[PDB]
Amino acid sequence: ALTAALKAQIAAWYKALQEQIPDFIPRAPQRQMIADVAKTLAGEEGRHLAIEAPTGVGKTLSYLIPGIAIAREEQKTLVVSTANVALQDQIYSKDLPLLKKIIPDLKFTAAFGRGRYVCPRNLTALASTEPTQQDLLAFLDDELTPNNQEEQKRCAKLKGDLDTYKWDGLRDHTDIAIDDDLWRRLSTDKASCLNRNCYYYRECPFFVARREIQEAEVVVANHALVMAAMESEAVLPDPKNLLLVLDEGHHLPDVARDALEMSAEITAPWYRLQLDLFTKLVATCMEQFRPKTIPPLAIPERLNAHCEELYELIASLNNILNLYMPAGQEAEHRFAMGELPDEVLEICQRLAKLTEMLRGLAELFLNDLSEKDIVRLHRLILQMNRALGMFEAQSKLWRLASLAQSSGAPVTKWATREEREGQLHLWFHCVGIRVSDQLERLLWRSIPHIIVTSATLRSLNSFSRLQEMSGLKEKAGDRFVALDSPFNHCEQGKIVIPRMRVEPSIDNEEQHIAEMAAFFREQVESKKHLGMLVLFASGRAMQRFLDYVTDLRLMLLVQGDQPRYRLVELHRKRVANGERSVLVGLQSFAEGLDLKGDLLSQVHIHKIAFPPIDSPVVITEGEWLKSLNRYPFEVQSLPSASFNLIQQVGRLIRSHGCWGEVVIYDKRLLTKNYGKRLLDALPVFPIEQPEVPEGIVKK
DNA sequence: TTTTTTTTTTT
Ligand code: SF4
């Protein structure tokens, strides 16, 4: 499988980059990862490879070089998939052009979902049309006019950039802030688009990007897109012709779980309204634009016999679920083991059938309208597209609610009664607990050999959690490799566990935050660190902590206040200037921050990020683990805590020459037996246990 | 055994 010419090509590109790009430094883990990826992707050894490549190993070049070599030899496409658009851009703008220097021949593109692309037609409307005081009837028309004059100028700037190729049309590739509402208007749904009819169709960024996919050697994708391309066999080449690298691979089950997740409203009056609107809309479609294809369900007698039966089912379900909950109150009911009582299951099966039928009708009408008075047709397309979305959520919901198991585990099922607009609304919720069958069918079986890599794949020094969640198995021929970290952590930093007076239990939170803040403040006062990061496991705790350090607002860059890349922008600017700067964030910061040396010398971790015990999904899972005679804490809480802790601690040492401390304020790392195990899955650091000032609680 | 709420993206 590894031909002579291929080894020669990989070696050549390797020597090329190491002695022609300044600072490219070889490493033995890098050589091993190149060889392992090369053997897996050529078919020489087993099926799939899950290789953990800690920061510093040089992971992306390590799979890019053999991946590209094998793709060229075989006239295949290398698909590199990562977690989100920012990481995609990192691969597309930094690593691939670097390889283009030594492979001038290289053909690579990036791929994104339709929703990230501007629609030239709409933007032209927004840039070239007058804001006229929200002309009232015109607002009611929502007829493509800039809300106001500021909006109009911004749109014209965006259009100027688009037309001269300063802007590629992707939402994330422009500096100009775009409101979410604005973006909804600037982009369009597949049906809403004019395709070959539009006078821009040859000029549309999205279609051009897909055209680039077709002749490219490397496509940079995100996991959601790849999954969607495996369900709809529609955007990527045929799986058999694919080399697939799933960078940031630990995210893969969660992404797969989107296919087993739905929440939707089911409250009976609202439902009556929706069905009435739909019936009326189908009749007006038939009158206004007779479709080419008229299904028997569109026949009015049949359509509203169908809708009346659906409604009667919904109303029965409302009554049943309402008996679980106090009247006139917001409430909640979870079904243990995700198991529905027989009558409720029966109802959900019939609902699944009826809502799926309505979804099919709406889809057929929608495609008929899109195939085809442009103004009136577009109003009708929009309404029917809304209807389609409603019934999509419905059929998916009832399909999941009807499942006995998914990948050998229950689907979490539960209802909520929530207040919204002066009223109580009934929601149903389904969340698949395991997703391995999904990954197996869409990826593992479909693509001959896949690389799953990440800086962090293991939990508790083990691939066990990854194996169980992903379905990858040695028995199927998948291999699992953990490369060593290059850095020397014990000499490069320390872990600090202050002598806190309370554990961060539920009752203790107020005192705990107080003690933390005191200690944290003293650290800031030492002026020993310029780059600081504070990491929380809940937004509740983060806000509470923020109340104690309100005198430090100037110094604090808080997740959400600005887009993360801007917050890191400012952080770099101030630290380079000699000022103290503190980032404060949740999971997004714990996962995404990569700050070397001065930029981040002290990491503050409020607590061990254990999963929420009262969450319905966690409860249902623990029930199921119990029924299999496994201990939930051992199998569910502690491994998640280990993975999260590895990731959080992983912010400190990003390079040789990184230095500093990780302050962990959860005393249970020393106080509980499991503490040792969490510490043993971290890199080795010396542990210091300083005394803590008295915690003054605030009103 | 022992634990308590985060986050992107797509058809
Ligand atoms: S093609 Fe669809 S998206 Fe591109 S411009 Fe015409 S309408 Fe807007």
Helix fraction?
40-55%
Which ligands are bound?
iron/sulfur cluster
Strand arrangement, largest sheet? Answer: 3-4-2-5-10-1-11
Number of beta strands:
18
**Beta-strand level of the residues, as a percent range?**
5-15%
Class derived from helix and strand content: alpha/beta
Number of helices: 26
Enzyme class: isomerase
Pfam families: DEAD (PF00270), DEAD_2 (PF06733), Helicase_C_2 (PF13307)
Protein name: ATP-dependent DNA helicase DinG
Cofactor: [4Fe-4S] cluster
Keywords:
metal ion binding, seven-stranded parallel sheet, 26 helices, DNA-binding, Rossmann fold, iron-sulfur, ATP-binding, 18 strands
Task: Walk me through the structure.
It is classed as dna binding protein. Keywords: translocase, DNA binding protein. This protein is of the alpha/beta class and 699 residues long. It has a domain at 489-688: P-loop containing nucleotide triphosphate hydrolases (Rossmann fold, 3-Layer(aba) Sandwich), CATH 3.40.50. The protein is built from 26 helices and 18 strands. A 7-stranded parallel beta sheet has the order 3-4-2-5-10-1-11, sandwiched between helices. It has a 7-stranded parallel beta sheet with strand order 14-15-13-16-17-12-18. β14 (556-558), α21 and β15 form a beta-alpha-beta unit. Iron/sulfur cluster (SF4) binds next to α5. The structure holds one DNA strand of 11 nucleotides.
Provide a concise account of the structure shown.
The chain is 48% helix and 12% strand. The relative contact order is 0.10.
